[PDB]
Design a protein around this ligand. Structure first.
Ligand code: ATP
Ligand code: GDP
Ligand code: MG
Lengths: 192, 349
Protein backbone atom coordinates (compact mmCIF):
# COMPACT_ATOMS: atom_id res chain seq x y z
CA UNK A 1 0.00 0.00 0.00
CA UNK A 2 1.23 3.49 -0.81
CA UNK A 3 2.74 5.03 2.30
CA UNK A 4 1.16 8.06 3.96
CA UNK A 5 3.68 10.28 2.16
CA UNK A 6 2.60 8.94 -1.24
CA UNK A 7 -1.06 9.36 -0.29
CA UNK A 8 -0.40 12.95 0.80
CA UNK A 9 1.37 13.65 -2.49
CA UNK A 10 -1.58 12.23 -4.42
CA UNK A 11 -4.21 14.10 -2.37
CA UNK A 12 -2.28 17.41 -2.11
CA UNK A 13 -3.59 17.39 1.47
CA UNK A 14 -1.96 16.89 4.85
CA UNK A 15 -3.10 13.74 6.65
CA UNK A 16 -2.85 12.13 10.06
CA UNK A 17 -1.70 8.57 10.63
CA UNK A 18 -5.19 7.75 11.93
CA UNK A 19 -6.84 9.08 8.76
CA UNK A 20 -4.41 7.11 6.61
CA UNK A 21 -5.07 3.95 8.64
CA UNK A 22 -8.83 4.41 8.26
CA UNK A 23 -8.42 4.82 4.51
CA UNK A 24 -6.19 1.74 4.26
CA UNK A 25 -8.66 -0.33 6.28
CA UNK A 26 -11.46 0.78 3.95
CA UNK A 27 -9.33 -0.19 0.94
CA UNK A 28 -8.62 -3.58 2.50
CA UNK A 29 -12.35 -4.13 2.99
CA UNK A 30 -12.96 -3.12 -0.63
CA UNK A 31 -10.39 -5.58 -1.96
CA UNK A 32 -11.64 -8.38 0.31
CA UNK A 33 -15.23 -7.72 -0.84
CA UNK A 34 -14.62 -9.69 -4.11
CA UNK A 35 -14.92 -6.59 -6.26
CA UNK A 36 -14.98 -6.16 -10.03
CA UNK A 37 -12.33 -5.12 -12.52
CA UNK A 38 -13.22 -1.42 -12.30
CA UNK A 39 -12.77 -1.44 -8.53
CA UNK A 40 -9.53 -3.43 -8.81
CA UNK A 41 -8.04 -0.97 -11.30
CA UNK A 42 -9.21 1.89 -9.09
CA UNK A 43 -7.37 0.27 -6.17
CA UNK A 44 -4.28 -0.15 -8.34
CA UNK A 45 -4.02 3.65 -8.11
CA UNK A 46 -3.14 3.05 -4.44
CA UNK A 47 -1.32 -0.28 -4.70
CA UNK A 48 2.46 -0.06 -5.03
CA UNK A 49 4.71 -2.79 -6.41
CA UNK A 50 7.60 -3.77 -4.15
CA UNK A 51 18.58 -15.13 -4.48
CA UNK A 52 22.32 -15.47 -5.06
CA UNK A 53 23.98 -14.63 -8.37
CA UNK A 54 26.26 -17.28 -9.87
CA UNK A 55 29.62 -16.54 -11.46
CA UNK A 56 30.17 -17.87 -15.00
CA UNK A 57 32.33 -20.92 -15.55
CA UNK A 58 35.53 -20.29 -17.51
CA UNK A 59 38.13 -22.55 -19.13
CA UNK A 60 41.88 -22.57 -18.46
CA UNK A 61 44.70 -23.05 -20.98
CA UNK A 62 44.07 -26.81 -21.03
CA UNK A 63 40.36 -26.00 -21.37
CA UNK A 64 39.61 -27.48 -17.96
CA UNK A 65 36.74 -25.73 -16.24
CA UNK A 66 36.96 -23.36 -13.28
CA UNK A 67 35.19 -20.48 -11.56
CA UNK A 68 36.49 -17.29 -9.97
CA UNK A 69 35.18 -15.27 -7.04
CA UNK A 70 36.17 -12.68 -4.45
CA UNK A 71 35.28 -12.00 -0.83
CA UNK A 72 36.18 -9.83 2.13
CA UNK A 73 36.18 -10.25 5.90
CA UNK A 74 37.30 -7.62 8.42
CA UNK A 75 40.27 -6.01 6.60
CA UNK A 76 41.07 -9.25 4.76
CA UNK A 77 40.36 -9.61 1.04
CA UNK A 78 40.64 -12.89 -0.86
CA UNK A 79 40.09 -14.12 -4.41
CA UNK A 80 39.52 -17.81 -5.11
CA UNK A 81 39.72 -19.94 -8.25
CA UNK A 82 37.87 -23.25 -7.86
CA UNK A 83 38.48 -25.87 -10.55
CA UNK A 84 35.87 -28.43 -11.59
CA UNK A 85 38.07 -31.43 -10.74
CA UNK A 86 40.81 -32.14 -8.24
CA UNK A 87 41.83 -33.93 -5.06
CA UNK A 88 40.73 -31.27 -2.56
CA UNK A 89 44.10 -29.51 -2.74
CA UNK A 90 43.83 -25.83 -1.79
CA UNK A 91 46.85 -23.59 -2.42
CA UNK A 92 46.73 -20.20 -0.68
CA UNK A 93 49.31 -17.75 -2.05
CA UNK A 94 50.93 -20.82 -3.60
CA UNK A 95 51.19 -22.55 -0.21
CA UNK A 96 49.13 -25.59 0.70
CA UNK A 97 46.39 -24.80 3.19
CA UNK A 98 47.73 -27.16 5.86
CA UNK A 99 50.92 -25.07 5.95
CA UNK A 100 49.35 -21.64 5.42
CA UNK A 101 46.80 -22.13 8.24
CA UNK A 102 48.40 -24.06 11.12
CA UNK A 103 45.22 -23.47 13.14
CA UNK A 104 42.70 -26.30 12.95
CA UNK A 105 39.95 -23.71 13.41
CA UNK A 106 40.94 -21.93 10.19
CA UNK A 107 41.32 -25.27 8.41
CA UNK A 108 37.77 -26.13 9.49
CA UNK A 109 36.63 -22.76 8.15
CA UNK A 110 38.21 -23.67 4.81
CA UNK A 111 36.54 -27.10 4.93
CA UNK A 112 33.08 -25.79 5.74
CA UNK A 113 31.66 -25.13 2.22
CA UNK A 114 32.82 -28.36 0.60
CA UNK A 115 31.67 -30.37 3.61
CA UNK A 116 28.31 -28.60 3.43
CA UNK A 117 27.81 -29.48 -0.25
CA UNK A 118 29.36 -32.97 0.12
CA UNK A 119 32.38 -32.25 -2.09
CA UNK A 120 35.37 -32.95 0.16
CA UNK A 121 38.16 -33.73 -2.28
CA UNK A 122 36.09 -33.15 -5.43
CA UNK A 123 37.81 -29.87 -6.39
CA UNK A 124 41.15 -28.10 -6.35
CA UNK A 125 41.42 -24.44 -5.43
CA UNK A 126 43.95 -21.62 -5.72
CA UNK A 127 43.35 -18.60 -3.50
CA UNK A 128 45.15 -15.30 -2.99
CA UNK A 129 44.45 -13.40 0.22
CA UNK A 130 45.80 -10.25 1.85
CA UNK A 131 45.14 -8.07 4.87
CA UNK A 132 43.52 -8.97 8.17
CA UNK A 133 44.73 -11.70 10.50
CA UNK A 134 44.64 -15.47 10.26
CA UNK A 135 40.94 -15.76 11.11
CA UNK A 136 39.93 -12.87 8.84
CA UNK A 137 41.87 -14.42 5.96
CA UNK A 138 40.29 -17.81 6.63
CA UNK A 139 36.80 -16.29 6.57
CA UNK A 140 37.48 -14.31 3.40
CA UNK A 141 38.85 -17.41 1.66
CA UNK A 142 35.82 -19.39 2.82
CA UNK A 143 33.47 -16.79 1.35
CA UNK A 144 35.36 -16.60 -1.95
CA UNK A 145 35.53 -20.39 -2.29
CA UNK A 146 31.81 -20.74 -1.54
CA UNK A 147 30.90 -18.08 -4.10
CA UNK A 148 33.07 -19.82 -6.70
CA UNK A 149 31.63 -23.24 -5.82
CA UNK A 150 28.18 -21.80 -6.50
CA UNK A 151 29.28 -21.86 -10.15
CA UNK A 152 29.31 -25.68 -9.98
CA UNK A 153 26.80 -26.81 -7.35
CA UNK A 154 23.13 -27.04 -8.31
CA UNK A 155 20.70 -24.21 -7.60
CA UNK A 156 19.19 -26.13 -4.69
CA UNK A 157 22.67 -26.48 -3.20
CA UNK A 158 23.34 -22.78 -3.81
CA UNK A 159 20.17 -21.79 -1.97
CA UNK A 160 21.01 -24.20 0.86
CA UNK A 161 24.48 -22.67 1.10
CA UNK A 162 22.98 -19.18 1.30
CA UNK A 163 20.57 -20.34 4.01
CA UNK A 164 23.56 -21.79 5.86
CA UNK A 165 25.28 -18.41 5.53
CA UNK A 166 28.21 -19.32 3.27
CA UNK A 167 27.39 -16.56 0.75
CA UNK A 168 26.79 -13.53 3.00
CA UNK A 169 29.64 -11.05 3.42
CA UNK A 170 30.01 -10.65 7.18
CA UNK A 171 29.46 -6.89 7.67
CA UNK A 172 30.89 -7.08 11.20
CA UNK A 173 34.03 -4.93 11.11
CA UNK A 174 36.00 -3.03 13.74
CA UNK A 175 34.19 -0.09 15.32
CA UNK A 176 36.02 3.23 15.56
CA UNK A 177 37.13 4.42 18.97
CA UNK A 178 35.18 7.47 20.09
CA UNK A 179 36.79 10.44 21.87
CA UNK A 180 36.38 10.52 25.63
CA UNK A 181 35.97 6.74 25.98
CA UNK A 182 38.42 3.85 26.14
CA UNK A 183 37.14 2.05 23.05
CA UNK A 184 34.14 1.57 20.79
CA UNK A 185 31.86 1.22 23.83
CA UNK A 186 34.09 1.04 26.94
CA UNK A 187 33.56 4.35 28.72
CA UNK A 188 36.14 5.57 31.20
CA UNK A 189 35.74 4.48 34.81
CA UNK A 190 33.07 6.81 36.17
CA UNK A 191 34.85 8.77 38.89
CA UNK A 192 33.21 9.61 42.21
CA UNK B 1 49.01 -55.36 9.33
CA UNK B 2 52.02 -57.16 7.87
CA UNK B 3 52.68 -60.76 8.77
CA UNK B 4 56.29 -59.77 7.92
CA UNK B 5 57.65 -58.14 11.08
CA UNK B 6 61.26 -58.56 9.91
CA UNK B 7 62.79 -55.11 9.20
CA UNK B 8 64.95 -56.53 6.39
CA UNK B 9 62.50 -58.80 4.54
CA UNK B 10 59.52 -56.46 4.15
CA UNK B 11 59.51 -54.84 0.73
CA UNK B 12 57.52 -52.75 -1.73
CA UNK B 13 54.55 -55.11 -1.42
CA UNK B 14 54.30 -53.99 2.22
CA UNK B 15 54.07 -50.29 1.32
CA UNK B 16 51.25 -48.80 3.37
CA UNK B 17 51.22 -51.98 5.48
CA UNK B 18 52.04 -52.00 9.17
CA UNK B 19 55.13 -53.41 10.87
CA UNK B 20 55.30 -54.36 14.55
CA UNK B 21 58.23 -53.76 16.91
CA UNK B 22 58.34 -55.93 20.01
CA UNK B 23 58.58 -54.35 23.48
CA UNK B 24 61.93 -56.10 24.00
CA UNK B 25 63.20 -54.52 20.78
CA UNK B 26 61.86 -51.14 21.89
CA UNK B 27 63.60 -51.37 25.26
CA UNK B 28 66.89 -52.55 23.76
CA UNK B 29 66.93 -50.23 20.74
CA UNK B 30 64.99 -47.02 21.53
CA UNK B 31 65.76 -45.77 25.04
CA UNK B 32 65.68 -42.39 23.27
CA UNK B 33 64.93 -40.78 19.92
CA UNK B 34 61.32 -41.83 19.44
CA UNK B 35 58.98 -38.86 18.92
CA UNK B 36 57.29 -37.99 22.23
CA UNK B 37 53.82 -38.39 20.75
CA UNK B 38 54.67 -41.78 19.28
CA UNK B 39 56.12 -42.82 22.65
CA UNK B 40 52.82 -41.84 24.26
CA UNK B 41 50.91 -43.78 21.61
CA UNK B 42 53.08 -46.84 22.28
CA UNK B 43 52.48 -46.60 26.02
CA UNK B 44 48.74 -46.29 25.37
CA UNK B 45 48.33 -49.13 22.86
CA UNK B 46 50.95 -51.57 24.19
CA UNK B 47 52.12 -51.74 20.56
CA UNK B 48 54.69 -50.07 18.30
CA UNK B 49 53.27 -50.49 14.80
CA UNK B 50 55.06 -48.40 12.17
CA UNK B 51 53.73 -48.04 8.63
CA UNK B 52 56.13 -49.22 5.92
CA UNK B 53 56.53 -46.13 3.74
CA UNK B 54 58.37 -45.49 0.49
CA UNK B 55 61.16 -43.30 1.97
CA UNK B 56 61.99 -45.88 4.64
CA UNK B 57 61.87 -48.66 2.05
CA UNK B 58 64.24 -46.76 -0.25
CA UNK B 59 66.70 -46.00 2.54
CA UNK B 60 66.60 -49.63 3.67
CA UNK B 61 67.29 -50.75 0.10
CA UNK B 62 70.24 -48.35 -0.13
CA UNK B 63 71.67 -49.63 3.15
CA UNK B 64 71.23 -53.25 2.05
CA UNK B 65 72.97 -52.57 -1.28
CA UNK B 66 75.75 -50.56 0.37
CA UNK B 67 79.39 -51.60 0.00
CA UNK B 68 81.30 -51.01 3.22
CA UNK B 69 84.62 -50.57 1.39
CA UNK B 70 83.57 -47.14 0.12
CA UNK B 71 83.56 -44.16 2.49
CA UNK B 72 80.41 -43.84 4.57
CA UNK B 73 77.54 -42.54 2.46
CA UNK B 74 75.43 -39.70 3.85
CA UNK B 75 71.66 -40.00 3.43
CA UNK B 76 69.38 -37.16 4.52
CA UNK B 77 65.76 -37.81 5.41
CA UNK B 78 64.13 -34.61 4.27
CA UNK B 79 60.79 -32.88 3.83
CA UNK B 80 58.07 -30.98 5.63
CA UNK B 81 57.33 -30.73 9.35
CA UNK B 82 55.73 -33.78 10.90
CA UNK B 83 55.85 -35.99 7.80
CA UNK B 84 57.46 -38.95 9.57
CA UNK B 85 61.16 -38.20 9.08
CA UNK B 86 62.05 -39.13 12.65
CA UNK B 87 60.01 -42.33 12.53
CA UNK B 88 61.60 -43.28 9.20
CA UNK B 89 64.99 -42.83 10.86
CA UNK B 90 63.72 -45.02 13.71
CA UNK B 91 62.64 -47.67 11.20
CA UNK B 92 66.10 -47.69 9.63
CA UNK B 93 67.62 -47.80 13.12
CA UNK B 94 65.57 -50.87 14.05
CA UNK B 95 66.53 -52.56 10.79
CA UNK B 96 70.24 -52.03 11.38
CA UNK B 97 69.93 -53.02 15.05
CA UNK B 98 68.36 -56.33 14.03
CA UNK B 99 71.14 -56.58 11.43
CA UNK B 100 73.66 -56.24 14.29
CA UNK B 101 75.27 -52.87 13.58
CA UNK B 102 76.58 -50.46 16.19
CA UNK B 103 73.95 -47.72 16.20
CA UNK B 104 75.44 -44.33 17.09
CA UNK B 105 72.04 -42.67 17.46
CA UNK B 106 71.66 -38.97 18.26
CA UNK B 107 67.95 -38.56 19.13
CA UNK B 108 67.86 -34.78 18.68
CA UNK B 109 70.87 -32.53 18.14
CA UNK B 110 68.64 -29.54 18.92
CA UNK B 111 68.56 -30.44 22.62
CA UNK B 112 72.33 -29.88 22.78
CA UNK B 113 72.29 -26.21 21.71
CA UNK B 114 69.80 -24.68 24.14
CA UNK B 115 68.59 -24.60 27.76
CA UNK B 116 71.87 -26.01 29.10
CA UNK B 117 72.77 -24.66 32.55
CA UNK B 118 75.66 -27.06 33.23
CA UNK B 119 77.61 -25.62 30.29
CA UNK B 120 81.26 -25.38 31.32
CA UNK B 121 84.56 -24.70 29.60
CA UNK B 122 86.12 -28.01 28.64
CA UNK B 123 89.09 -28.84 30.85
CA UNK B 124 90.76 -30.91 28.13
CA UNK B 125 90.54 -27.92 25.78
CA UNK B 126 89.68 -24.46 27.10
CA UNK B 127 88.68 -23.43 23.56
CA UNK B 128 85.53 -25.58 23.79
CA UNK B 129 82.70 -26.04 26.28
CA UNK B 130 81.28 -29.26 27.73
CA UNK B 131 77.67 -30.21 28.48
CA UNK B 132 77.99 -32.87 31.19
CA UNK B 133 74.27 -33.46 31.78
CA UNK B 134 73.45 -34.02 28.11
CA UNK B 135 76.63 -36.07 27.63
CA UNK B 136 75.76 -38.44 30.48
CA UNK B 137 72.12 -38.67 29.39
CA UNK B 138 73.15 -39.67 25.88
CA UNK B 139 75.82 -42.07 27.15
CA UNK B 140 73.37 -44.01 29.33
CA UNK B 141 70.98 -44.62 26.43
CA UNK B 142 73.88 -45.42 24.10
CA UNK B 143 75.11 -48.10 26.50
CA UNK B 144 71.59 -49.47 26.83
CA UNK B 145 71.33 -49.61 23.04
CA UNK B 146 74.72 -51.15 22.18
CA UNK B 147 75.96 -52.86 25.34
CA UNK B 148 76.78 -56.14 23.60
CA UNK B 149 79.13 -54.49 21.08
CA UNK B 150 80.56 -52.22 23.78
CA UNK B 151 82.87 -54.74 25.46
CA UNK B 152 84.47 -55.89 22.20
CA UNK B 153 85.96 -52.49 21.30
CA UNK B 154 89.65 -52.07 22.19
CA UNK B 155 90.68 -48.48 22.87
CA UNK B 156 93.89 -47.47 21.11
CA UNK B 157 95.29 -44.71 23.37
CA UNK B 158 95.62 -43.60 26.99
CA UNK B 159 92.90 -41.19 28.10
CA UNK B 160 93.54 -39.29 31.33
CA UNK B 161 90.47 -38.17 33.27
CA UNK B 162 92.66 -36.62 35.97
CA UNK B 163 96.33 -36.37 36.89
CA UNK B 164 95.76 -39.64 38.79
CA UNK B 165 93.07 -41.53 36.83
CA UNK B 166 93.27 -42.85 33.28
CA UNK B 167 92.13 -45.60 30.92
CA UNK B 168 94.72 -47.56 28.95
CA UNK B 169 95.12 -48.85 25.40
CA UNK B 170 93.64 -52.31 24.96
CA UNK B 171 90.80 -51.59 27.39
CA UNK B 172 87.13 -52.17 26.49
CA UNK B 173 85.21 -49.10 25.39
CA UNK B 174 82.78 -50.07 28.14
CA UNK B 175 85.39 -48.71 30.54
CA UNK B 176 85.22 -45.28 28.91
CA UNK B 177 81.43 -45.39 28.68
CA UNK B 178 81.13 -46.24 32.37
CA UNK B 179 83.63 -43.53 33.32
CA UNK B 180 81.64 -40.94 31.39
CA UNK B 181 78.34 -42.12 32.84
CA UNK B 182 79.57 -42.16 36.45
CA UNK B 183 81.98 -39.21 36.64
CA UNK B 184 79.66 -36.58 35.21
CA UNK B 185 82.47 -34.04 34.77
CA UNK B 186 84.12 -36.41 32.25
CA UNK B 187 80.96 -37.32 30.31
CA UNK B 188 81.62 -34.98 27.39
CA UNK B 189 85.21 -36.18 27.00
CA UNK B 190 83.96 -39.77 27.18
CA UNK B 191 81.47 -39.03 24.40
CA UNK B 192 84.23 -37.55 22.27
CA UNK B 193 86.49 -40.56 22.86
CA UNK B 194 83.60 -42.87 22.01
CA UNK B 195 82.93 -41.08 18.72
CA UNK B 196 86.63 -41.20 17.82
CA UNK B 197 86.98 -44.90 18.64
CA UNK B 198 83.79 -45.89 16.82
CA UNK B 199 84.75 -43.92 13.71
CA UNK B 200 88.23 -45.44 13.55
CA UNK B 201 87.20 -49.00 14.41
CA UNK B 202 84.55 -48.94 11.68
CA UNK B 203 87.33 -48.31 9.17
CA UNK B 204 89.44 -51.01 10.83
CA UNK B 205 86.50 -53.35 10.21
CA UNK B 206 85.76 -54.19 13.84
CA UNK B 207 82.02 -53.68 13.27
CA UNK B 208 79.53 -52.05 10.94
CA UNK B 209 78.59 -48.57 12.17
CA UNK B 210 75.34 -46.69 11.55
CA UNK B 211 75.43 -43.03 12.56
CA UNK B 212 71.82 -41.87 12.88
CA UNK B 213 71.42 -38.18 13.77
CA UNK B 214 68.11 -36.36 14.05
CA UNK B 215 67.95 -32.61 13.55
CA UNK B 216 71.33 -32.56 11.83
CA UNK B 217 70.87 -28.89 10.95
CA UNK B 218 71.55 -28.07 14.61
CA UNK B 219 75.23 -28.90 14.03
CA UNK B 220 75.55 -25.59 12.15
CA UNK B 221 72.52 -23.56 13.21
CA UNK B 222 73.20 -20.80 15.70
CA UNK B 223 72.96 -21.73 19.38
CA UNK B 224 71.05 -19.83 22.06
CA UNK B 225 73.68 -20.56 24.73
CA UNK B 226 75.57 -17.69 26.35
CA UNK B 227 78.99 -17.19 27.91
CA UNK B 228 79.58 -15.79 31.38
CA UNK B 229 79.58 -12.38 29.66
CA UNK B 230 76.13 -13.02 28.12
CA UNK B 231 77.85 -13.46 24.76
CA UNK B 232 76.59 -15.98 22.17
CA UNK B 233 78.45 -19.26 21.73
CA UNK B 234 79.10 -20.60 18.24
CA UNK B 235 78.04 -24.21 17.55
CA UNK B 236 81.58 -25.53 17.09
CA UNK B 237 82.62 -24.32 20.55
CA UNK B 238 80.54 -27.16 22.02
CA UNK B 239 82.61 -30.32 22.31
CA UNK B 240 79.65 -32.55 21.46
CA UNK B 241 78.88 -30.54 18.32
CA UNK B 242 82.55 -30.54 17.31
CA UNK B 243 82.90 -34.31 17.69
CA UNK B 244 79.60 -34.93 15.90
CA UNK B 245 80.74 -32.78 12.97
CA UNK B 246 83.92 -34.86 12.88
CA UNK B 247 81.77 -38.00 12.83
CA UNK B 248 79.58 -36.56 10.06
CA UNK B 249 82.69 -36.02 7.96
CA UNK B 250 82.75 -38.90 5.48
CA UNK B 251 86.46 -39.65 5.95
CA UNK B 252 85.74 -43.21 7.08
CA UNK B 253 84.12 -46.45 5.93
CA UNK B 254 82.59 -49.56 7.45
CA UNK B 255 79.24 -47.88 7.95
CA UNK B 256 76.66 -45.36 6.84
CA UNK B 257 75.45 -41.96 8.02
CA UNK B 258 71.73 -41.18 8.08
CA UNK B 259 70.63 -37.71 9.18
CA UNK B 260 67.09 -36.36 9.42
CA UNK B 261 66.26 -32.71 8.93
CA UNK B 262 63.89 -31.19 11.48
CA UNK B 263 62.61 -27.63 11.61
CA UNK B 264 60.92 -28.47 14.91
CA UNK B 265 63.18 -27.44 17.77
CA UNK B 266 65.49 -25.59 15.37
CA UNK B 267 66.86 -22.18 16.32
CA UNK B 268 66.51 -19.11 14.08
CA UNK B 269 64.68 -20.88 11.25
CA UNK B 270 61.21 -20.05 9.90
CA UNK B 271 58.37 -22.52 10.25
CA UNK B 272 57.87 -22.98 6.50
CA UNK B 273 61.55 -23.90 5.98
CA UNK B 274 61.76 -27.51 4.79
CA UNK B 275 64.40 -27.33 2.02
CA UNK B 276 67.86 -28.78 2.76
CA UNK B 277 69.90 -25.66 2.05
CA UNK B 278 67.36 -23.54 3.92
CA UNK B 279 67.48 -25.74 7.03
CA UNK B 280 71.22 -26.51 6.99
CA UNK B 281 72.56 -23.12 5.93
CA UNK B 282 75.32 -23.05 3.33
CA UNK B 283 77.92 -24.15 5.90
CA UNK B 284 75.97 -27.28 6.80
CA UNK B 285 75.09 -28.02 3.19
CA UNK B 286 78.76 -27.95 2.19
CA UNK B 287 79.74 -29.95 5.28
CA UNK B 288 77.30 -32.75 4.41
CA UNK B 289 77.89 -32.47 0.65
CA UNK B 290 77.78 -34.76 -1.28
CA UNK B 291 74.68 -36.48 0.14
CA UNK B 292 71.58 -38.37 -0.98
CA UNK B 293 68.36 -36.60 0.10
CA UNK B 294 65.32 -38.81 0.65
CA UNK B 295 61.98 -37.00 0.59
CA UNK B 296 59.19 -37.84 3.03
CA UNK B 297 55.78 -36.42 2.13
CA UNK B 298 52.18 -36.60 3.29
CA UNK B 299 50.37 -39.93 3.30
CA UNK B 300 49.13 -41.24 -0.02
CA UNK B 301 45.51 -42.46 -0.05
CA UNK B 302 46.52 -46.04 0.80
CA UNK B 303 48.75 -44.91 3.67
CA UNK B 304 45.94 -42.73 5.01
CA UNK B 305 43.49 -45.63 4.84
CA UNK B 306 45.97 -47.96 6.56
CA UNK B 307 46.60 -45.50 9.40
CA UNK B 308 42.87 -44.91 9.88
CA UNK B 309 42.33 -48.68 9.94
CA UNK B 310 45.04 -49.06 12.59
CA UNK B 311 43.38 -46.42 14.77
CA UNK B 312 39.95 -48.03 14.32
CA UNK B 313 41.38 -51.46 15.17
CA UNK B 314 42.84 -50.01 18.37
CA UNK B 315 39.48 -48.26 18.95
CA UNK B 316 41.40 -45.01 19.40
CA UNK B 317 38.82 -43.05 17.37
CA UNK B 318 36.18 -43.45 20.05
CA UNK B 319 34.06 -40.76 18.38
CA UNK B 320 30.73 -42.19 17.26
CA UNK B 321 30.88 -40.79 13.71
CA UNK B 322 34.63 -41.28 13.16
CA UNK B 323 34.25 -44.66 11.37
CA UNK B 324 31.89 -43.10 8.82
CA UNK B 325 33.31 -42.09 5.46
CA UNK B 326 32.19 -38.53 6.24
CA UNK B 327 34.48 -38.52 9.27
CA UNK B 328 37.24 -40.14 7.23
CA UNK B 329 37.04 -37.36 4.64
CA UNK B 330 36.90 -34.71 7.37
CA UNK B 331 40.08 -36.08 8.94
CA UNK B 332 41.74 -36.32 5.52
CA UNK B 333 40.94 -32.68 4.76
CA UNK B 334 41.92 -31.30 8.17
CA UNK B 335 45.25 -33.15 8.26
CA UNK B 336 45.77 -32.85 4.48
CA UNK B 337 47.27 -36.36 4.83
CA UNK B 338 50.04 -35.04 7.10
CA UNK B 339 50.81 -37.86 9.58
CA UNK B 340 51.59 -35.50 12.46
CA UNK B 341 48.43 -33.43 12.07
CA UNK B 342 46.32 -36.56 11.58
CA UNK B 343 47.75 -38.14 14.73
CA UNK B 344 47.14 -34.96 16.73
CA UNK B 345 43.56 -34.78 15.43
CA UNK B 346 42.82 -38.43 16.23
CA UNK B 347 44.38 -37.91 19.67
CA UNK B 348 41.14 -36.32 20.91
CA UNK B 349 38.56 -38.32 18.92
N1 ATP C 1 55.76 -43.94 9.11
C1 ATP C 1 54.97 -43.63 10.14
N2 ATP C 1 54.36 -44.63 10.82
C2 ATP C 1 53.57 -44.31 11.85
N3 ATP C 1 53.27 -43.11 12.33
C3 ATP C 1 53.88 -42.15 11.63
C4 ATP C 1 54.73 -42.31 10.56
N4 ATP C 1 55.17 -41.08 10.11
C5 ATP C 1 54.59 -40.21 10.90
N5 ATP C 1 53.81 -40.80 11.85
C6 ATP C 1 53.02 -40.16 12.88
O1 ATP C 1 53.39 -38.80 12.92
C7 ATP C 1 54.25 -38.59 14.06
C8 ATP C 1 55.68 -38.82 13.65
O2 ATP C 1 56.12 -37.71 12.84
P1 ATP C 1 57.65 -37.28 13.00
O3 ATP C 1 57.95 -37.10 14.45
O4 ATP C 1 58.51 -38.21 12.22
O5 ATP C 1 57.69 -35.86 12.28
P2 ATP C 1 58.75 -35.21 11.27
O6 ATP C 1 57.97 -34.61 10.35
O7 ATP C 1 59.87 -36.08 10.88
O8 ATP C 1 59.40 -33.89 11.89
P3 ATP C 1 58.99 -32.76 12.90
O9 ATP C 1 57.59 -33.07 13.35
O10 ATP C 1 60.00 -32.79 14.01
O11 ATP C 1 59.08 -31.54 12.03
C9 ATP C 1 53.68 -39.55 15.11
O12 ATP C 1 52.56 -38.97 15.76
C10 ATP C 1 53.27 -40.75 14.26
O13 ATP C 1 52.11 -41.38 14.74
N1 GDP D 1 89.93 -36.04 28.51
C1 GDP D 1 90.30 -36.58 27.35
N2 GDP D 1 89.51 -36.47 26.28
C2 GDP D 1 90.04 -37.07 25.19
C3 GDP D 1 91.24 -37.74 25.09
N3 GDP D 1 91.43 -38.22 23.80
C4 GDP D 1 90.35 -37.83 23.15
N4 GDP D 1 89.47 -37.15 23.94
C5 GDP D 1 88.20 -36.58 23.50
O1 GDP D 1 88.27 -36.38 22.11
C6 GDP D 1 88.73 -35.03 21.85
C7 GDP D 1 90.00 -35.10 21.04
O2 GDP D 1 89.69 -35.55 19.70
P1 GDP D 1 90.86 -35.66 18.62
O3 GDP D 1 90.43 -36.58 17.52
O4 GDP D 1 92.15 -35.91 19.31
O5 GDP D 1 90.89 -34.18 18.01
P2 GDP D 1 90.71 -32.75 18.71
O6 GDP D 1 89.34 -32.78 19.33
O7 GDP D 1 90.84 -31.73 17.61
O8 GDP D 1 91.81 -32.66 19.73
C8 GDP D 1 88.84 -34.36 23.22
O9 GDP D 1 88.44 -33.00 23.18
C9 GDP D 1 87.90 -35.21 24.07
O10 GDP D 1 86.54 -34.86 23.89
C10 GDP D 1 92.08 -37.85 26.22
O11 GDP D 1 93.18 -38.41 26.31
N5 GDP D 1 91.51 -37.23 27.33
MG1 MG E 1 59.82 -35.65 13.23
Amino acid sequence: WLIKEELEEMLVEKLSDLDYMQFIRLLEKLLTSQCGAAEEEFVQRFRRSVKQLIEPVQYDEQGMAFSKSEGKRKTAKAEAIVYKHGSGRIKVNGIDYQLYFPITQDREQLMFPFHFVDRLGKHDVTCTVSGGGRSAQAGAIRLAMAKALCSFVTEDEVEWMRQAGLLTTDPRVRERKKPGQEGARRKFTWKK
Amino acid sequence: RTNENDPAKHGDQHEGQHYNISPQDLETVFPHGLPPRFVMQVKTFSEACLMVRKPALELLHYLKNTSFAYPAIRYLLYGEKGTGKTLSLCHVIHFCAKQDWLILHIPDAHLWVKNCRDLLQSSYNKQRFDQPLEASTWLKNFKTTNERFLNQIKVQEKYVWNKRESTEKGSPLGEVVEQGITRVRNATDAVGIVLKELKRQSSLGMFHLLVAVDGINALWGRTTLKREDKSPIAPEELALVHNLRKMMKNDWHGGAIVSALSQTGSLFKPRKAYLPQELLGKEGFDALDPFIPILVSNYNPKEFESCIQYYLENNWLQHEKAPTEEGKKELLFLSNANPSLLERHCAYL
